Amino acid sequence: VLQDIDGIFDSQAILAGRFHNDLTVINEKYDLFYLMLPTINEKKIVSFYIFLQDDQIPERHREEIESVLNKFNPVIKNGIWKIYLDTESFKLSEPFSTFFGIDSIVFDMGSMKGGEMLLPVRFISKDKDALVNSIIDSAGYGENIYLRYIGQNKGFDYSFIAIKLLDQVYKLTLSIDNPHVMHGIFAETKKNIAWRRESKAPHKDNTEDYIYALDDTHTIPDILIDTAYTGEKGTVYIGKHSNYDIYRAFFGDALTNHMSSVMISENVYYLRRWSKYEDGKLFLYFYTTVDFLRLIPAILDSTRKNFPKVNMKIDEITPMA
Amino acid sequence: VLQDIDGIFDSQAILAGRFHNDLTVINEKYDLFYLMLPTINEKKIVSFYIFLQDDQIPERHREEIESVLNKFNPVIKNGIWKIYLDTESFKLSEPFSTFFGIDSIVFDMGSMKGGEMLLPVRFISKDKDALVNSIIDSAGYGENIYLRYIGQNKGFDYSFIAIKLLDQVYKLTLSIDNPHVMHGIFAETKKNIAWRRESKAPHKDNTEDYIYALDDTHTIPDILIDTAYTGEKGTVYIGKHSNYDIYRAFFGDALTNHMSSVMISENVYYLRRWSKYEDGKLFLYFYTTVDFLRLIPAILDSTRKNFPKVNMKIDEITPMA
Amino acid sequence: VLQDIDGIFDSQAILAGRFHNDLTVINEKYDLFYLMLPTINEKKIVSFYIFLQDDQIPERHREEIESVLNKFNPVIKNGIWKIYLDTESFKLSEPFSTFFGIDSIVFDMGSMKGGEMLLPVRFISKDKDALVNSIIDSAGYGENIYLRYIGQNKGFDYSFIAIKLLDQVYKLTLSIDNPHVMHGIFAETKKNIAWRRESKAPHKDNTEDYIYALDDTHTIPDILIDTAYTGEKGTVYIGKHSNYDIYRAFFGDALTNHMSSVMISENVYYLRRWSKYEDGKLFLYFYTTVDFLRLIPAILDSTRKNFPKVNMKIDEITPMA
Amino acid sequence: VLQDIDGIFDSQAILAGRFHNDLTVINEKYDLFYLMLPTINEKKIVSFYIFLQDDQIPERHREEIESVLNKFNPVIKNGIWKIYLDTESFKLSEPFSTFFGIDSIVFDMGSMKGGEMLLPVRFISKDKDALVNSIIDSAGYGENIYLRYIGQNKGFDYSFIAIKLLDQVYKLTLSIDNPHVMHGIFAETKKNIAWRRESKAPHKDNTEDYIYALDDTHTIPDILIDTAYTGEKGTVYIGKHSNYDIYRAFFGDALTNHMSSVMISENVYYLRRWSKYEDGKLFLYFYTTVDFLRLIPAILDSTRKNFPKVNMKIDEITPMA
Amino acid sequence: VLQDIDGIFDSQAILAGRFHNDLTVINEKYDLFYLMLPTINEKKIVSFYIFLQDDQIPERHREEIESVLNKFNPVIKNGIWKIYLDTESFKLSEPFSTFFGIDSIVFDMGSMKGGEMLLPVRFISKDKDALVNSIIDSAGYGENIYLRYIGQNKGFDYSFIAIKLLDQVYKLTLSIDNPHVMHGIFAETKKNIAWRRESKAPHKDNTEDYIYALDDTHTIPDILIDTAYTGEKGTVYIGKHSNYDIYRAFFGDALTNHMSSVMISENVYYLRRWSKYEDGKLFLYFYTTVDFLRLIPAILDSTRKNFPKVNMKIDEITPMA
Numbered sequence A, B, C, D, E: 001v002l003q004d005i006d007g008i009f010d011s012q013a014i015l016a017g018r019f020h021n022d023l024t025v026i027n028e029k030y031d032l033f034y035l036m037l038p039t040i041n042e043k044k045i046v047s048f049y050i051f052l053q054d055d056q057i058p059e060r061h062r063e064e065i066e067s068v069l070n071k072f073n074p075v076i077k078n079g080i081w082k083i084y085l086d087t088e089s090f091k092l093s094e095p096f097s098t099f100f101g102i103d104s105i106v107f108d109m110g111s112m113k114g115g116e117m118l119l120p121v122r123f124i125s126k127d128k129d130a131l132v133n134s135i136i137d138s139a140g141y142g143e144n145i146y147l148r149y150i151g152q153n154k155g156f157d158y159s160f161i162a163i164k165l166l167d168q169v170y171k172l173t174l175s176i177d178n179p180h181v182m183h184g185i186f187a188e189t190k191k192n193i194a195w196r197r198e199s200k201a202p203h204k205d206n207t208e209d210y211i212y213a214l215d216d217t218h219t220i221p222d223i224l225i226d227t228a229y230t231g232e233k234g235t236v237y238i239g240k241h242s243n244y245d246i247y248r249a250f251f252g253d254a255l256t257n258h259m260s261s262v263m264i265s266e267n268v269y270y271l272r273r274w275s276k277y278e279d280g281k282l283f284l285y286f287y288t289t290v291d292f293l294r295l296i297p298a299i300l301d302s303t304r305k306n307f308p309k310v311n312m313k314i315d316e317i318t319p320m321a
């Protein structure tokens, strides 16, 4: 029986690399820790947000570090520095865009420590050779993206360990018992449609790029009966897991998008998100550090006011493992 | 079979928040630890007592710390600073009063560390949505209260861990084999009445606000035969647990009130208290640190002299694993 | 089957208190550790010997500490300071003497650390209420003695942990196969008399105060057939454990007394001692730190010369786990 | 059933020694760590490459250390100092060549720490007395080399522990499903030939010296059907393990040779390598630290281009437990 | 079934003491560690060699320490200081000689730390009272020797722990398949003689003093058929263990003697040695630290050349768990 969609991904890899740039120098120089949030745009180009805890800056060196950070047009909020690395500011943007283009590849939250970037990905083993080959083709003289791990999926939660995140992680579960109120992918209420979903990219800009696991009793047209979904109707059939059809899909919902843009405007984000739809009920699962927890009340207040017809509950908030 | 009344509470939450005030500033600045004792008045408004161990003040910074503490009209006794935060000095008094008003909510001992307040609550799951909603509504008014945990009750003793209390906790058991000499809720000796009890607030001022679990063989009128109980006869029916009726009730006894009033006058208090009544016999259970233990002999001497007909034993004092 | 007499004691308590006195001030001020040996005199007044390791005195503060110690008429020997402290023999309040007077109460070795004394006692549960009541009454006379533990007997060896003794403890077993040559309580050789014994006080002066567990096949008169025992013939019947009659008794033997006075004249002592008599054979069990071990050869040499008809063996010396 | 060829080696030894030379002096004086790679030439003379992490040089003494290192004609690349110790610069070259000449002896990666050299070897118990005797004879000519261990094979992975390598080790698995396109030892595709292989020396120069374990259904001539193998056709029969014939053999393949020369030109190397051939498929197993991993993409790119007909996959990269 | 001769020794004791001498003062003063090797002469008087690791001398205090050491005519070799303490300089020589004279007593390696000497012994329980009595009698002459342990044998390897040896211990096994070429105790080859052996003293001078465990199928005259053994034919029958006769015996072999004198001339020694003879094969077992291992090749080279007819093998060298 398929519960967490993580179960359809039989493979996992830990990508590693270095790009030289003043942020990297100080990271290595002063033992700093960055969280690196992958973001895709409408043309599926990969970029990154960088997050730095203000209180993790050694006071001895604050002056030098701040002067380097300020060159990158930072936003400081809730004790967190947020820096955007556009395609140009981020030389490695072209290999990561290639990896992303491999259908079953799901990007997890990354990090930078000791000047080295770590990015976990989860995927389906048929795509393993394509991933390996683009890493090898990409290889030139000098610094190359490489593999610290590739093999069976150790779990989405291993990704947190792989990137050296030491902070306590929490699991948040939200439930929405009347999602049909939003129409779109929730419009069909008579067929017992059931699916699981996880984004290929944790953050995105004017686009959708999801892995849907759909109970094969139904097809995509059973879901898309109106024009109120976000993104586009297009899909790519990936394969089967048990009694589920796996799709890469370019449509989504506005509620998850809203929550994402509100939270990043507060310089916080989740490490992982996936959702479950069955029996006409929507479940949202977030894995986060405490920063996100502080803002949950405000974020849900905003989300409720922007989606006033939606019934939205917190099922539970639990520390993990 | 229901032993500890904790068993009727299937849910638990850890509330967290911050309020700006000089006490908060020094706590964060100098790594201090406060215990925060919730107190309700007759109008069911929540306030707090703050407790600080004198020997936990770093001596280098004592001068600055003491000058801040003295602005809050402190009482110093038995090596402990006691500070009262009235509704006015304590901005967050209105959300917590709202939480308290939710029938099954029981406040545990709170703390403050790193400038952040932690307050555990235990409750019955039917009231979960009401609690969450007032937290979210509160966030719409500016308030920064949030949840570090909400889900199954991990136990009253998890609360001690949640608030980061590192001190050894002890369990004290008192027994009273002739409570009927106090009359009030103990006046009925003919019926095999049985119940468990725990206060919704650890401390209170001229009021009673209890959760009673009453063996459903009997009703509240079976207990209230005279007018010698403390508080008021009023109740709110909450629901059923096994063969027990659960009530919120506004009546109590003078003996427990006396003990509470004596011990706080000595700047000590328990972390948790509940009681059991069955076979005409009363049991009192206290969970405390060593400060309270030092004063148990004096407190019981006082209690005996004020209630000279009552037979009062120490059944057990044990450290908790 | 009853082996260690510890098995007849179903209860245990850890007494705690403070002596207001300069020895207390320096103990707390300079993180010293005292062993506190309870001693009774002929009138059953409890006093204490205080033991301090000379090499545990921080030299930076030796001058101040020595000047305080010398006010108490110390004896220094084998690197150990020995001080006699009498508080109860004169004034009104005499709490430890009162506890001792409770029949089944057995005092273990105490300690003083962080300005607080810890004193374990073992006893039989029928006497629990009497102990608690005198502690509560004692608090009405000013006295600050309280309970850090009261409940089941965790074992004589828990007492060592309770008083925060970190030193390695050793078990010494002596056997005497011809104790009848001393007469007294060993005079009767024709009846299959069997008993266990432990003193209510680890040290004593011109008195005996024992708990005897006697196989109920026999009575006290079966033992006392001559006049050559030490102390008095008097007993108080305490109760039954299995097939053993429990007595408080005021008679003993000269050999155990001799060993005690020799070793304390050398400023060393055991943490616990008990004995077994069966099949006309005597066993002595000592629990001690290494200080006592160093002097065992000399002490046994002395004991043999003072009791030249006695055959005395070391059965075993083992570290305790 | 034989999986890892390590299973044919029932014996293992840890050789230890000291040679006087300035590299040894600084190694001991400043707590440096060298990896030492045994290398053989066409005349089977053993030499060593020395590897030193640049970032492990204490900056305090960098000047002195670098001046000593530069006397040995170092190559610095990828943060690693590589130094070649030729037979004359390396007095102990005569005993180690003798050990190597013992047929079943396999050299593992060695290390130097605290001025002492550690070199693990794995072998078949048949050769134990010969190894011991040459150590004792070698001693007679000047005592230096000795044994820290000799007995059962604890495993190839124990060798990593023996040399005190603290770095995380990784297992890399490559598979080649069409090795027959290289001809040579892979030319025969019609017979169900199966074997395992491991080099007696981790690195080599213009020579081959392998242990082959060949399923005894076939013989060496069944493998060597053309003239396109590297090295020479010669073998020495060592014995049997289960259903496998063990040979020392002087032929190999060009692909593994290429990978070895490319990686050492980058100052990285594996700790261990072995290969498996069965069902027309070749498996290559590498055990390495992270330095090797960084260069895998470049190394495989080079290997693919020099062997364009070969299908080469990464099966797995896993950290070792 | 009897393997290690340690199995015949059911008892063990740890002797402890102090003798005043400048070596003792400095050991205590500077936290030094000595190994103390018991040695007997032809008159069975016990003396000691003292071993001190040069690199364990704190450089701060080297001058003072060396000046004290040099007064005792030290030999320095292989980084080790060796000092002989003759009977006169070693006041305690007379009690230890008495202990040694007790037939079943076996001396292990001793140590001195914190100015206190620790010496483990193993023996057979019938001799316990004799050992205890000479310790007690000794204490009547002034002597400060005492027992930190006496009871069942915890094993020869517990002795290493008792003396606070922190160094890694190794087990070396030698085998000699043709010991009859040395004649003496190995001359009889036609009877299936089997025995185990361990010296009562780890080192000795012109004497033999062994415990032999001889399979009781045979007697001592069955062994001694020629005059080519070392020492004397005399024995003392100790008793039985299973099917083995236990003897104290004053004859031995020249090969073990040679190895001992060569290794101590290099300032190294074993912690324990015993041997097994059965099926015409001799096994020698050594337990040692690494110092001895460094010199094994030289020692065996020397031993082979002095006994050219003897076939010697290293069976195994393993670290001890």
Ligand SMILES: [Ca+2]
Residues within 6 Å of the ligand: A215, A216, A217, A243
């Ligand atoms: Ca279905």
Ligand SMILES: [Ca+2]
Residues within 6 Å of the ligand: B215, B216, B217, B243
């Ligand atoms: Ca009922």
Ligand SMILES: [Ca+2]
Residues within 6 Å of the ligand: C215, C216, C217
């Ligand atoms: Ca009986």
Ligand SMILES: [Ca+2]
Residues within 6 Å of the ligand: D215, D216, D217, D243
């Ligand atoms: Ca076959």
Ligand SMILES: [Ca+2]
Residues within 6 Å of the ligand: E215, E216, E217, E243
């Ligand atoms: Ca036999």
Ligand SMILES: [Cl-]
Residues within 6 Å of the ligand: A197, A198, A199, A256, A273, A274, A275
């Ligand atoms: Cl999702």
Ligand SMILES: [Cl-]
Residues within 6 Å of the ligand: B197, B198, B199, B256, B273, B274, B275
């Ligand atoms: Cl209560």
Ligand SMILES: [Cl-]
Residues within 6 Å of the ligand: C197, C198, C199, C256, C273, C274, C275
């Ligand atoms: Cl006794």
Ligand SMILES: [Cl-]
Residues within 6 Å of the ligand: D197, D198, D199, D256, D273, D274, D275
């Ligand atoms: Cl290979």
Ligand SMILES: [Cl-]
Residues within 6 Å of the ligand: E197, E198, E199, E256, E273, E274, E275
């Ligand atoms: Cl031997």
